[PDB]
Design a protein around this ligand. Structure first.
Ligand code: MG
Ligand code: MG
Ligand code: MG
Ligand code: MG
Ligand code: MG
Ligand code: MG
Ligand code: MG
Ligand code: MG
Ligand code: MG
Ligand code: MG
Ligand code: MG
Ligand code: MG
Ligand code: MG
Ligand code: MG
Ligand code: MG
Ligand code: MG
Ligand code: MG
Ligand code: MG
Ligand code: MG
Ligand code: MG
Ligand code: MG
Ligand code: MG
Ligand code: MG
Ligand code: MG
Ligand code: MG
Ligand code: MG
Ligand code: MG
Ligand code: MG
Ligand code: MG
Ligand code: MG
Ligand code: MG
Ligand code: MG
Ligand code: MG
Lengths: 138, 61, 226, 386
RNA sequence: AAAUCAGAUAAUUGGUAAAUACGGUUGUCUGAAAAGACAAUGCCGUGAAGCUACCAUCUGUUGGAUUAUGACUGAAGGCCUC
RNA sequence: GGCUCUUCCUAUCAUUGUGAAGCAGAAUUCACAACGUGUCGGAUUGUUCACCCGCUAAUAGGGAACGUGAGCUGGGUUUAG
RNA sequence: UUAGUGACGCGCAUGAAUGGAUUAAUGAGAUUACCACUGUCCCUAUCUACUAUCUAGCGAACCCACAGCUAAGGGAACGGGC
RNA sequence: CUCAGAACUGAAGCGGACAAAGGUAAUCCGA
C-alpha cells in the first residue's frame, strides 16, 4: 500500500529544486518540523543523476526534527513551496523563501489540519486535500 | 489592452516576459523588474533612500 | 429532490472543483462530460452553470466564495477569468476581486444567503467587503477549533454539516450564531473534510461518490431538501 | 568485463563525422514530396536571422494545460527580403541518378548576382554573362524550355538573394535552386517562365500558422574538448593529466580505436535541417503596424528599441517563428516546406497573438517605444526637432 | 503531457566580469582639494555584450519487403491439410 | 576494485508482434521472431560478491588480455617502521 | 549501517613491571556520529595569467633487426611479416 | 599618552585591504 493515488491530473513542468537529501520545512501541524528527502516518485534516471522533486511532487522522506513518534520511520510528503525559481505560463519566474512540504498518506490525504504559509498553485490542481487545507494559494 | 505590471521596488512599469517574483513567509508577493531591484528590496534597502527610484522622486518633488 | 453523487476525474473532492450558491454554479474548465451532466441535469434552466478557472487552476471551489448577492474571487484571478465570470453572471449578482493574504476564499469563508463565517484572521476590509458585497452578517470563528471554516463547514439557508469533532457546546454557539440547525458528521466515506466532499444550496446537493447511504441520509436530512 | 552500469551512448552517430560544412546557405537534399495535386508552387525560400523576442498569445488548443489562457513564448525573427528569379533548370532521370539537362538564363542578371562568380567585382572587367547578353535570342530560350518540357522529370527555378536590400557587409547575392512542385511538367515550365526576371515574396510561399523547416549552419565553436563536444561525464577532479578527458579510448582488442568513441575536435559550423517550426507571423516591411496586435492598437515595428543586437533594423518583410533556429545573427537560412504537409495538432493550431515585445534587448529594457522613454523622462524629440 | 536520448539556440531567468564598465571602501603616496596610482584582479555591490544550463528555451517523419504467428486456394494421397 | 568510454553476445529483465495454460477479468507462468532501444539513486564493505532502503517499463546474465594504471585512483594485496 | 558505541563472553589464541585495570592535561597519531560549511556531488559553466599554437633566433634526449591497415586461419596454443 | 559618556549621519555598511581558530559528543593508543 503506497504511491501517489490521489493526484487529480498532470503536474506542470517545474525546475527540479529538491534533489535527494534535500531537507525542507514541514508546514503541517503533524508535529514534524522538517522532511529529509529520500526518493521522489516516477523517476528513472541517468547514471549518477540525483533524483529530484519540485513543487507538486510526492516525495518519500523521513522526519529529522519533530515528535519522536514521527521520526525514525519512512513517510510520504507533498512539496508545497520551493526556493528554486521555476517559470509559469506568463514567462515570469517565481520562488518562495523556504522549501516546504506536507506529510501525506499515499492516497493524497494529509495527516494534519492547518498548513503554515502559502501553497503554490501547482500543488493545488494536483492535490485537492492539500488545496482544501491551504490558507492561501499562490 | 496590454496589461502592465508595476515593480514593487521602484514602481517601474513592467511588461510581459520580463522580471521575477518573490513570496515571503507572509504570503506577500513581490514582483521585480531587475535583478538589481530584487537584490535591493531583499537587502531591505528602502526604496525612498535610493535616487533612481520613484519612491525617492516622490519624497522630494 | 435528492443528493447526487459525482466524481471529478477520479477524486471525490467535488467541493474543490465547484462553487454552488442559490443563484449560480461554478465548475472547473477541463471536466469530463459525466461531471457536467450530473450538474446541468439538475440545475440547468434554473441557474447559470459557469465553466471557469481561477489563476488558471481548477480549484475554483476552494479559492472563491459567495452567495446569491455576490462573488469574491482571490487576487489569483486572471482578468479574463473575471470577465468571463461577469458575462456569465446575472446582473443581480456582483463580482469582486479581493486581496487577502489568505487567498483561498472558499477555505476561509463559509456563506449562505444571510450569515457568513470567516477565518479569525482575515482583513477588516475583506470582512466589510464580504458584508457589503454578499450582503451578510459576518462572524470570525473556528469550526472544531480549526481556522478554515469554508473547508470544515457546509451551509445552506436551512441547516449545516460541520466537522465531526465539533463539541456540543461549539455546535450550540454556531447554531445560535447562524440562526440555523447544525449537525456534526462526515462525508465521502468517513472524511472529516466535509467542505471538500460536499456542495449544497437550498434545493440541491452534490457530493462525492463514496459517501455512504447513511451519510447521504444525514445530508438530505439536515439540509432539508427532503 | 561486462561494463558495470549501462547508460546510453554519448552522441548520435548519424551526426558524424563532426567536421565543418561545405554548404554555407542551406542545402536541402530533399525537396518536399512532389504532388500533382496543386498548381506548381515554389518549394523553399531564403532569409536571414535577425533576432529573438517573446510573444504573448492566447491558446485555443483543446485538451491542453493551456486551453483558453495567456502563454508567453520565445520567438525568432527572420528578415525575408524578396528573392529574384534568374533561371530555369531541367533535370533528367538517369540510371545513375538525376542530372542537369539545362539552365535557361534571363536577359537580366544584376551585378550583385554576377558577383557570385567573382571574388572581387571591382578589380574585374565584369565580363560575366556578356555573351549571353549580346547573343540573346528569345527564340532559342523558348526552344530550351520546350526541350525541358520534352525530356524532363524535375523542374527548378534558379533564384536570387538580393543582398542590397539589407544593411550588412556582404552585398554579393545568393544563387539557389528552388524546385517547383506541381502536377504536369509542362505547367511547371510555364510557371517557371512566368517567374523569370521577377521578384518573389515570402507570402507567395509561406502562410501563417503554417509549419516550416529551417536549413542552415550551426554557429562555429571551433576546436572543442570532449566534454563540450559529446557531453561526456567529467573524470574525477583528482585526476593527474586532467579531468576533461574521456577515461578509456578503448579496450585492448580490437587493436585500434573505433570510430564510435568520442574524441577532441571541431564543434560548430555544421549543417542542420530543423523540422516543424511554426510561423507565428509573416509581415510586410511596409506596415509600421507590423509588430502590433488587434489587442495592441498602437504603431509597432518588430525592430527592438536600439535595434536587433549584432544585426540591425529590419526594414524588409519577415517571418516570425516559434522558438529558436540554427546559427548566429545574420546567418542566411533556407526555409523549406515540410517534406509531407503536417497534419498534427500543433500544426492545426490557430494562433492568436496578443503581445509582441518591441522592448530593447541591449540591456534589460522597460520601454516599448521611444515615445515611451521620452514621456517618462520628459524629452519630446518632436519638440527638439521643432 | 512527461522521462531518457538526440540536435540547436540565448527572447526571458540564472551563472560568469580584468568591458577594470560605474559606484563604494581599507592602507599608502602625489603639500591640499580635485584626480589618481601601488597592494601580480586590494576588497565589496550592481554590471552591457559574449559564452553558458532541464538552472533557460525550441525541434525531433513516411513507405516497401518480410519474421514468428493466424489464414485463403490446394495436391501429392478421391477425403485431409496454411 | 571502482571511476570513465566503446563495442560485441543472447542462455531476453523491460519494450514490439505472436503461439500455449490448471489463460473469466486482473495478475502470472511456458514458448516463438527478436537487442532495435533501455536496464537507475543510497546505507555497510577496498571490495567481485552479499544484504538492506528506494524509484522504475524493467531495475536481464555475459564478452572484449577475469576490456579499460605512459586514463586516473591506490582503499585492498605484497618491501623496508 | 561487514561501520561506531554499550552490553553479553562454550575467550581458535585476554590476563597481571614478558605488567593487568584505570586516567585529567595532551597529539600534523588510528576510528564514528552530529552542527556549521561548502563546486566533493547532482552538472557542469564562465573569467585572468603562463603554456600548448604561429613567427625570428637558438636547439637536445629516450628509442631504433626490418618495418608499420585489418578479418580469419594455421603457427612457440593473441601476427606486421605467412 | 590612556578610559568612559552623549548626539547627529549613511543602501544596517564600518577587524571594509592587509592580518586572522570552524564546532560538538564518543572510542583506541601514548602519560
Ligand atoms: Mg544527514
Ligand atoms: Mg556513479
Ligand atoms: Mg545500446
Ligand atoms: Mg534524394
Ligand atoms: Mg548543449
Ligand atoms: Mg602531456
Ligand atoms: Mg544577468
Ligand atoms: Mg584612499
Ligand atoms: Mg581626494
Ligand atoms: Mg610605487
Ligand atoms: Mg610585494
Ligand atoms: Mg589579495
Ligand atoms: Mg568586482
Ligand atoms: Mg554578480
Ligand atoms: Mg520536448
Ligand atoms: Mg517526441
Ligand atoms: Mg532466443
Ligand atoms: Mg524448462
Ligand atoms: Mg556510492
Ligand atoms: Mg584486468
Ligand atoms: Mg611492513
Ligand atoms: Mg557512514
Ligand atoms: Mg555493528
Ligand atoms: Mg586528536
Ligand atoms: Mg602570424
Ligand atoms: Mg621558431
Ligand atoms: Mg588460433
Ligand atoms: Mg591480424
Ligand atoms: Mg561612546
Ligand atoms: Mg547608526
Ligand atoms: Mg567583515
Ligand atoms: Mg573536524
Ligand atoms: Mg606522544
Amino acid at each position: 500500500a503506497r504511491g501517489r493515488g490521489g493526484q487529480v491530473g498532470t503536474k506542470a513542468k517545474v525546475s527540479l529544486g529538491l534533489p535527494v537529501g534535500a531537507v525542507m520545512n514541514c508546514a503541517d501541524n503533524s508535529g514534524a518540523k522538517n522532511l529529509y528527502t529520500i526518493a521522489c516518485f516516477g523517476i528513472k534516471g541517468h547514471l549518477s543523476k540525483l533524483p529530484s522533486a519540485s513543487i507538486g511532487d510526492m516525495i518519500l522522506c523521513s522526519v529529522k526534527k519533530g515528535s519522536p513518534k514521527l521520526r525514525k520511520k519512512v513517510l510520504q510528503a507533498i512539496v508545497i513551496r520551493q526556493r528554486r525559481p521555476w517559470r509559469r505560463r506568463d514567462g515570469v519566474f517565481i520562488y518562495f523563501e523556504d522549501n516546504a512540504g506536507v506529510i501525506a498518506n499515499p492516497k493524497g490525504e494529509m495527516k494534519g489540519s492547518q498548513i503554515t504559509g502559502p501553497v503554490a498553485k501547482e500543488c493545488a490542481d494536483i492535490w485537492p486535500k492539500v488545496a482544501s487545507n491551504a490558507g492561501s494559494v499562490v | 489592452v496590454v496589461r502592465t505590471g508595476t515593480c514593487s521596488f521602484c514602481e517601474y512599469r513592467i511588461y510581459p516576459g520580463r522580471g521575477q517574483r518573490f513570496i515571503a513567509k507572509d504570503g506577500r508577493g513581490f514582483f521585480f523588474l531587475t535583478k538589481k531591484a530584487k537584490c535591493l528590496s531583499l537587502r531591505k534597502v528602502k526604496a525612498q533612500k535610493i535616487t533612481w527610484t520613484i519612491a525617492r522622486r516622490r519624497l522630494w518633488k | 429532490s435528492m443528493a447526487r453523487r459525482c466524481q471529478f476525474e477520479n477524486s471525490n473532492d467535488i467541493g474543490v472543483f465547484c462553487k454552488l450558491t442559490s443563484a449560480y454554479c461554478l465548475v472547473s474548465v477541463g471536466a469530463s462530460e459525466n461531471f457536467y451532466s450530473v450538474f446541468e441535469s439538475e440545475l440547468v434552466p434554473h441557474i447559470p452553470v459557469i465553466h471557469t478557472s481561477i489563476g488558471g487552476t481548477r480549484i475554483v471551489g476552494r479559492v472563491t466564495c459567495g452567495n446569491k448577492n455576490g462573488l469574491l474571487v482571490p487576487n489569483t484571478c486572471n482578468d479574463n477569468e473575471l470577465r468571463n465570470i461577469r458575462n456569465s453572471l446575472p446582473d443581480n449578482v456582483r463580482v469582486r476581486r479581493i486581496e487577502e493574504k489568505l487567498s483561498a476564499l472558499g477555505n476561509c469563508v463559509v456563506a449562505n444567503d444571510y450569515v457568513a463565517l470567516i477565518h479569525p484572521d482575515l482583513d477588516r476590509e475583506s470582512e466589510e467587503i464580504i458584508a457589503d458585497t454578499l450582503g451578510v452578517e459576518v462572524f470570525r470563528t473556528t469550526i472544531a477549533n480549526n481556522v478554515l471554516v469554508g473547508t470544515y463547514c457546509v451551509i445552506n439557508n436551512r441547516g449545516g454539516l460541520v466537522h465531526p469533532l465539533a463539541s456540543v457546546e461549539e455546535l450550540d454557539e454556531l447554531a445560535n450564531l447562524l440562526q440555523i440547525p447544525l449537525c456534526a458528521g462526515t462525508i465521502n466515506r468517513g472524511s472529516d473534510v466535509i467542505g471538500a466532499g460536499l456542495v449544497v444550496n437550498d434545493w440541491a446537493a452534490f457530493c462525492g461518490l463514496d459517501t455512504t447511504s447513511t451519510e447521504i441520509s444525514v445530508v438530505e436530512n439536515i439540509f432539508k431538501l427532503n | 568485463s561486462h561494463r558495470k552500469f549501462e547508460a546510453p551512448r554519448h552522441g548520435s552517430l548519424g551526426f558524424r563525422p563532426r567536421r565543418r560544412t561545405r554548404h554555407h546557405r542551406g542545402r536541402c537534399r530533399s525537396f518536399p514530396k512532389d504532388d500533382p495535386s496543386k498548381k506548381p508552387h515554389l518549394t523553399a525560400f531564403t532569409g536571414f536571422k535577425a533576432g529573438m523576442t517573446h510573444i504573448l498569445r492566447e491558446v485555443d488548443r483543446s485538451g491542453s494545460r493551456h486551453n483558453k489562457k495567456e502563454v508567453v513564448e520565445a520567438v525568432t525573427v527572420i528578415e525575408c527580403p524578396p528573392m529574384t528569379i534568374v533561371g530555369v533548370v531541367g533535370y533528367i532521370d538517369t540510371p545513375r541518378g538525376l542530372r542537369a539537362l539545362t539552365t535557361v538564363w534571363a536577359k537580366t542578371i544584376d551585378n550583385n548576382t554576377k558577383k557570385r562568380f567573382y571574388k572581387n567585382w571591382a578589380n574585374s572587367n565584369k565580363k560575366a554573362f556578356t555573351h549571353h547578353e549580346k547573343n540573346f535570342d528569345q527564340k532559342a530560350q523558348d526552344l530550351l524550355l520546350k526541350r525541358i518540357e520534352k525530356y524532363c522529370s524535375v523542374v527548378r527555378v534558379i533564384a536570387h538573394t538580393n543582398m542590397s536590400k539589407l544593411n550588412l557587409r556582404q552585398k554579393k547575392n545568393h544563387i539557389l535552386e528552388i524546385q517547383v512542385n506541381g502536377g504536369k511538367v509542362a505547367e511547371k515550365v510555364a510557371f517557371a517562365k512566368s517567374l523569370l526576371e521577377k521578384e518573389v515574396k515570402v507570402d507567395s510561399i509561406f502562410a501563417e500558422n503554417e509549419m516550416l523547416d529551417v536549413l542552415g549552419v550551426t554557429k562555429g565553436k571551433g576546436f572543442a574538448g570532449v566534454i563540450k563536444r559529446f557531453g561526456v561525464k567529467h573524470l574525477q577532479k583528482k585526476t593527474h593529466r586532467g579531468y576533461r578527458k574521456v577515461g578509456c579510448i578503448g579496450a585492448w582488442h580490437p587493436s585500434r580505436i573505433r570510430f564510435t568513441v568520442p574524441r577532441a575536435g571541431q564543434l560548430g559550423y555544421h549543417h542542420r535541417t530543423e523540422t516543424n517550426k511554426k510561423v507565428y507571423r509573416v509581415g510586410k516591411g511596409d506596415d509600421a503596424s507590423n509588430a502590433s496586435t488587434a489587442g495592441d492598437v498602437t504603431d509597432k515595428a518588430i525592430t527592438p528599441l536600439g535595434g536587433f543586437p549584432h544585426y540591425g533594423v529590419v526594414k524588409n518583410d519577415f517571418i516570425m517563428i516559434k522558438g529558436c533556429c540554427v546559427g548566429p545573427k545574420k546567418r542566411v537560412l533556407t526555409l523549406r516546406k515540410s517534406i509531407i504537409p503536417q497534419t498534427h495538432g500543433a500544426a492545426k493550431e490557430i494562433i492568436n497573438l496578443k503581445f509582441i515585445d518591441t522592448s530593447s534587448k541591449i540591456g534589460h529594457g522597460r520601454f516599448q517605444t521611444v515615445e515611451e522613454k521620452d514621456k517618462f523622462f520628459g524629452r519630446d524629440r518632436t519638440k527638439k526637432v521643432e
